[PDB]
Ligand binder design. Structure first.
Ligand SMILES: C[S@](=O)CC[C@H](N)C(=O)O
Length: 205
């Protein structure tokens, strides 16, 4: 049992890699939310926004810390009607709602600009296509294939904490030192630890 935040802040690849680099974030998935059609998809998006579902351990990171990361990944100071990329916070309860509203007020005071992020109730979140998940990792072929065999397949891999961290590492959002600690948590057999580590070290160059 973990806590859930659902945010929208533009194309979801960067957010996936950024939030997935953070201690306390257990898993991420990208998808679509905020519209009024069931089962949207990339070429049939309707009025939905590109969104990220963050599953986090509230004992380790708070919703307030996640909102602060959210507002540091983009600066939503213009009003657009482009639903696919609109800045939105989908609250799952009234505590999330009030923390978001308060933090939005603080930001507007501290920097002087109106924030256009819509703070709205989460209705339905729909998972994006598999090719959008852990996008940087998926497109780093050897590392991906190795990790995928270790986790037992695509679904198990992309739902894992280590994939979230690896994806963030490839994207440039996590140090190799922190990544290595994460690899340590998984307790791989020595040989697999070494295969993964040499790919990762080769990526650092
Ligand atoms: C998920 S974003 O809307 C897609 C952006 C585009 N395919 C690109 O590679 O630049």
């Amino acid at each position: 049992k973990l806590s859930i935040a659902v945010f929208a802040l533009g194309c979801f690849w960067g957010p996936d890699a950024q939030f997935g680099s953070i201690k306390g974030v257990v898993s991420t998935r990208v998808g679509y939310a905020g519209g009024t059609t069931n089962n949207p998809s990339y070429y049939n998006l309707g009025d939905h926004s590109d969104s990220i579902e963050i599953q986090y351990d509230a004992n380790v990171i708070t919703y307030g810390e996640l909102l602060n990361i959210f507002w540091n990944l983009h600066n939503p100071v213009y009003e657009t009607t482009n639903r696919q990329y609109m800045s939105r916070i989908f609250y799952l309860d009234d505590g999330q709602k009030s923390e978001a509203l308060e933090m939005k007020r603080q930001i507007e005071a501290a920097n002087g600009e109106k924030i256009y992020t819509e703070i709205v109730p989460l209705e339905n979140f729909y998972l994006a296509e598999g090719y959008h998940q852990k996008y940087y990792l998926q497109n780093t072929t050897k590392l991906y294939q190795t990790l995928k065999a270790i986790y037992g397949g695509f679904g198990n891999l992309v739902r894992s904490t280590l994939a979230a961290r690896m994806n963030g590492y490839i994207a440039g959002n996590l140090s190799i030192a922190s990544l290595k600690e994460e690899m340590d948590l998984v307790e791989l057999p020595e040989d697999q630890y070494e295969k993964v580590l040499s790919i990762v070290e080769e990526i650092k160059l």
